[PDB]
Design a binder for this molecule. Structure first.
Ligand code: CLA
Ligand code: CLA
Ligand code: CLA
Ligand code: CLA
Ligand code: CLA
Ligand code: CLA
Ligand SMILES: CCCCCCCCCCCCCCCCCC(=O)OC[C@H](CO[C@@H]1O[C@H](CO)[C@H](O)[C@H](O)[C@H]1O)OC(=O)CCCCCCCCCCCCCCCCC
Ligand SMILES: CCCCCCCCCCCCCCCCCC(=O)OC[C@H](CO[C@@H]1O[C@H](CO)[C@H](O)[C@H](O)[C@H]1O)OC(=O)CCCCCCCCCCCCCCCCC
Ligand SMILES: CC1=C(/C=C/C(C)=C/C=C/C(C)=C/C=C/C=C(C)/C=C/C=C(C)/C=C/C2=C(C)CCCC2(C)C)C(C)(C)CCC1
Ligand SMILES: CC1=C(/C=C/C(C)=C/C=C/C(C)=C/C=C/C=C(C)/C=C/C=C(C)/C=C/C2=C(C)CCCC2(C)C)C(C)(C)CCC1
Ligand SMILES: CC1=C(/C=C/C(C)=C/C=C/C(C)=C\C=C\C=C(C)\C=C\C=C(C)\C=C\C2=C(C)CCCC2(C)C)C(C)(C)CCC1
Ligand code: SF4
Ligand code: SF4
Lengths: 66, 41, 60, 141, 150, 80
């Protein structure tokens, strides 16, 4: 089947070291490629210290939230 | 001009707000000066 | 060469740009994402050669 | 592939500057950067003020390397030029530094092998106590 | 309350007396019918009124001759602290509650920061009087007061 | 000299390598991202520690880190 969380779905970050740690964001796409350590690119409404609004995460680093 | 209204409500909104507040406070004092307590109860 | 009076005709006059904070800079005209935006707006307000690179515009 | 070697090539026209080499060059190390110029051109010296590039091969000796890359980086953009720099030492041995692998570092090359990369990325490193008394350090792992 | 009421404090009376003599002294140079004179006589009348009210409102005084405030909660001095305070907390609560009503109205919108640097005055004027009944924030607290995510 | 590490969090943008003033990093083939490349610190002896690399990383958290260590002439940025 398709690999990760749906595209529309919003997720909760589990990185700990991420700026948007216990917060949420929406997934843009999921790299379908195995070997790729961190796919699941996500974007956030608010910018981080480095002025960027998107980052990639591991599969176990995100929880679908509703 | 929509736009002029837009210049306004910027931090000019702060000064118009505080100038109004300052005026109100000043008049109150002019009316009720040297008040160290609320004596109406 | 001969020295003379040289000018150009009207170059715009509107409140449109008053309604748009940080219009002079392309980076800061997009609006704030952090409170740093506000300070930068006042610190680059008079940096004319930072706004454009045309010497004629800066001089004017 | 083998690096280029030198050197007997001429150096650029300059008048003298105080930013030049010192005792460190004599007893520790010094660097040389070399390039090919299409025209005789003027450039800003990192150490000094202004110098004239000499058409053809050019040789410049600078202290510290960073000076070498700063000038070299400027050479790559600004004007299009190909440059290389080596570490001299005092004995006479010389050492090729940059590029060092054919191609520039920005561009991925197959010959290169990784150094200092941790496959458990993240800040998944262990607490300092865990390595306490173990010469190690958490990142080294 | 180791103090004595101001009405019956000698030091408190000496201060009113000394102050009036100082202003009256200045009164001498300006002669009578005069602008400064009327200005000084107005300060003197404002001075008498001041001390008169303090005594009138039962405020204790200290050996210094100056009123002192009781904030213990004692009933005779709520005017000194408690009454004005509640008044404050009402206003402070008002301002904060209205300020928080604006951000929530603004939050789900376009560029939310755009209305934080350029105020939506129609929206603000709509929300300002909601602070009048801000202590019915309590009833929001029974449900949607604060975020559960944290 | 200083210590510089890279992490599989790297996306191969290559910006640090472009940012470095002393040619410490370089890119090498890899298969953990779409760029298929990853940074490397094969010459940490020439690093100065200005962290221009870190200042240029877009990973949520830096994928390149610089741990300032023992000081050497090279790291102290001395022309004398
Ligand atoms: C350190 C940097 C920094 C900077 C530059 C700012 C800047 C700002 N903050 Mg932030 N803040 C900061 C740090 C900072 N903050 C920190 C560390 C925190 C804690 C996490 C906060 C928490 C915070 C909150 C909760 C809020 C802000 C808000 C604001 C904005 C208020 C603008 C304003 O006052 O207009 C003017 C404000 C008025 C009330 C003027 C009154 C206008 C009235 C209502 C309408 C106009 C009436 C008219 C003018 C009067 C008529 C009289 C006339 C006819 C005479 C401003 C952009 C506020 C905001 O977003 O704005 C909406 C907001 O609510 N800040
Ligand atoms: C230009 C000079 C000037 C002059 C001559 C006045 C004169 C006056 N003011 Mg105005 N005021 C001014 C400037 C001025 N003000 C400015 C610049 C501001 C800020 C914008 C104000 C804000 C203000 C307020 C809020 C009030 C006054 C009030 C008053 C009146 C006192 C009413 C009374 O009977 O007392 C006694 C009243 C009791 C209740 C006792 C008096 C006619 C009062 C008034 O008449 O309300 C409309 C009132 O409360 N003034
Ligand atoms: C935060 C500390 C603090 C506190 C608690 C006070 C408190 C007070 N000050 Mg001080 N003041 C302060 C800091 C403070 N001040 C600082 C830092 C300065 C230097 C700028 C001053 C300079 C100053 C001067 C020059 C005067 C005072 C006066 C007063 C008294 C006037 C009360 C009044 O206006 O009538 C009542 C006002 C209201 C009830 C307004 C609120 C009602 C709203 C607008 C209406 C809402 C209705 C619902 C009050 C005891 C005045 C005084 O005469 O002392 C006795 C006075 O002359 N203050
Ligand atoms: C003459 C040119 C000029 C000047 C002097 C200013 C000055 C200021 N700007 Mg503005 N700005 C300008 C042009 C200018 N700007 C233009 C052309 C634009 C559009 C491109 C902007 C867009 C802009 C934004 C978006 C913001 C500012 C803000 C500010 C304030 C910085 C925050 C601060 O002071 O702390 C404290 C703020 C105050 C103390 C508010 C009161 C200010 C008034 C002038 C004092 C009121 C006087 C009072 C009634 C009597 C004295 C009371 C006493 C107790 C102090 C400062 C007053 C920030 C701001 O004001 O935040 C609310 C802010 O968010 N500016
Ligand atoms: C002929 C006089 C003159 C002129 C035309 C300029 C013009 C300029 N300067 Mg220079 N400067 C001057 C004199 C002058 N300066 C002097 C005498 C000094 C020594 C202090 C400096 C030091 C200086 C520095 C370090 C910098 C400039 C910069 C600039 C450029 C942008 C500045 C700006 O945006 O304004 C913005 C204006 C403000 C943010 C106002 C800030 C308010 C000040 C700091 C405090 C005012 C307090 C007031 C005096 C009293 C308190 C009142 C308060 C309670 C309300 C602009 C080309 C900047 C640049 O990068 O050049 C391209 C730059 O970084 N200037
Ligand atoms: C130091 C801690 C402390 C605290 C938290 C309090 C708190 C309080 N005191 Mg107390 N008091 C204290 C020390 C303290 N006191 C000391 C050391 C003395 C020695 C004099 C007193 C003497 C004293 C007297 C004589 C009275 C109080 C009263 C009060 C209550 C007034 C508030 C109210 O009316 O209800 C809240 C009102 C609204 C919310 C509106 C309040 C519960 C008053 C009281 O008993 O309340 C009826 C009162 O009569 N206190
Ligand atoms: C922004 C502009 C637009 C906004 C405006 C819209 C709202 C409009 C509403 C305006 C209506 C005005 C209402 C008029 C009210 C009357 C004013 C009045 O009565 O005069 C003030 C009056 C007193 O007034 C007195 O009245 C007497 C009666 O005849 C005489 O008239 C006297 O002349 C007069 O002095 O009462 C007070 O409230 C003053 C009490 C001061 C309280 C201070 C005590 C606090 C100090 C100690 C506490 C310390 C706290 C620190 C805690 C931390 C410690 C660690
Ligand atoms: C019941 C209210 C009546 C009453 O208490 O009488 C109030 C009594 C008497 O009250 C006093 O009576 C005197 C008569 O001799 C005078 O009339 C005084 O004016 C009057 O204040 O005083 C107290 O008991 C004060 C109690 C304060 C206790 C201190 C700690 C408070 C702990 C409360 C914690 C809650 C914090 C919020
Ligand atoms: C003209 C001009 C100029 C200048 C100007 C100036 C210099 C100014 C100013 C000004 C100022 C300097 C001001 C002010 C003000 C203030 C006010 C108006 C106040 C107030 C307040 C209040 C209201 C108070 C309150 C209170 C009380 C009493 C009680 C409690 C506490 C408190 C404190 C809160 C110049 C040269 C630049 C040029 C241009 C033009
Ligand atoms: C007169 C009167 C009154 C009134 C009262 C009121 C109504 C008030 C108010 C007021 C207000 C409403 C106010 C205010 C203010 C504020 C401020 C003043 C602030 C600030 C700030 C700051 C300073 C901060 C800073 C910072 C930051 C921001 C971050 C972190 C760090 C820091 C901390 C630095 C009463 C009746 C009661 C009594 C009597 C009379
Ligand atoms: C009685 C009395 C006293 C004492 C007192 C006390 C000791 C108490 C207390 C107190 C306390 C211990 C308190 C607490 C608390 C808490 C909390 C936990 C809070 C909270 C909150 C909130 C959440 C709010 C919010 C809001 C509002 C509501 C309004 C505006 C807006 C805002 C948002 C800010 C004295 C002797 C002095 C004087 C006499 C009287
Ligand atoms: S800069 Fe950061 S992300 Fe870009 S390559 Fe170097 S490490 Fe990877
Ligand atoms: S720190 Fe400065 S020197 Fe050391 S690697 Fe990052 S960029 Fe190169």
């Amino acid at each position: 089947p398709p690999i990760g969380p749906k595209r529309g779905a919003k997720v909760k970050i589990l990185r700990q070291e991420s700026y948007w740690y216990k917060g949420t964001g929406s997934v843009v796409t999921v790299d379908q490629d195995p070997n790729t350590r961190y796919p699941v690119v996500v974007r956030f409404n608010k910018v981080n210290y480095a002025n960027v609004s998107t980052n990639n995460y591991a599969l176990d680093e995100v929880e679908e939230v509703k | 001009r929509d736009l002029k209204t837009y210049l306004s409500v910027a931090p000019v909104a702060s000064t118009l707000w505080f100038a109004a507040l300052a005026g109100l406070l000043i008049e109150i004092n002019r009316l009720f000066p040297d008040a160290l307590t609320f004596p109406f109860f | 060469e001969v020295k003379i009076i040289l000018d150009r005709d009207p170059i715009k006059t509107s409140f449109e740009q008053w309604a748009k904070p940080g219009h002079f800079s392309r980076t800061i005209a997009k609006g704030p994402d952090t409170t740093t935006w506000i300070w930068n707006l006042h610190a680059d307000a008079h940096d004319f050669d930072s706004h454009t690179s045309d010497l004629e515009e800066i001089s004017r | 592939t083998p690096p280029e070697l030198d050197p007997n090539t001429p150096s650029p026209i300059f008048g003298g500057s105080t930013g030049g080499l010192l005792r460190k060059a004599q007893v520790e190390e010094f660097y040389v950067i070399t390039w090919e110029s299409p025209k005789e051109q003027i450039f800003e010296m990192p150490t000094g003020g202004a110098a004239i590039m000499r058409e053809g091969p050019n040789l410049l000796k600078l202290a510290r390397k960073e000076q070498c890359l700063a000038l070299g980086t400027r050479l790559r953009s600004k004007y299009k030029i190909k440059y290389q720099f080596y570490r001299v030492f005092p004995s006479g041995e010389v050492q090729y530094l940059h590029p060092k692998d054919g191609v520039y570092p920005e561009k991925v090359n197959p010959g290169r092998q990784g150094v200092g990369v941790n496959f458990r990325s993240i800040g998944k490193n262990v607490s300092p106590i865990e390595v306490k008394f173990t010469g190690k350090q958490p990142y080294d792992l | 309350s180791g103090l004595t009421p101001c009405k019956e404090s000698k030091q408190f009376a000496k201060r009113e007396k000394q102050s009036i003599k100082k202003l009256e002294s200045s009164l001498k140079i300006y002669a009578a019918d005069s602008a400064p004179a009327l200005a000084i006589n107005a300060t003197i009348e404002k001075t008498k009124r001041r001390f008169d009210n303090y005594a009138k409102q039962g405020l204790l005084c200290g050996a210094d001759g100056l009123p002192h405030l009781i904030v213990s909660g004692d009933q005779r001095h709520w005017g000194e602290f408690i009454t004005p305070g509640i008044l404050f907390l009402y206003i402070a609560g008002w301002i904060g509650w209205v300020g928080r009503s604006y951000l929530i109205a603004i939050r789900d919108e376009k560029k939310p920061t755009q209305k934080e640097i350029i105020i939506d005055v129609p929206l603000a004027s709509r929300l300002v009087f909601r602070g009048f009944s801000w202590p019915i924030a309590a009833y929001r607290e029974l449900l949607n007061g604060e975020l559960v995510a944290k | 000299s200083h210590s510089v590490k890279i992490y599989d969090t790297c996306i191969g943008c290559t910006q640090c390598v472009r940012a470095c003033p002393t040619d410490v990093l370089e890119m090498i083939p890899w298969g953990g991202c779409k760029a298929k490349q990853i940074a490397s610190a094969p010459r940490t002896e020439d690093c100065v520690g200005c962290k221009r690399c870190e200042s240029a990383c877009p990973t949520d958290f830096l994928s390149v880190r610089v741990y300032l260590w023992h000081e050497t002439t090279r790291s102290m940025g001395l022309a004398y």
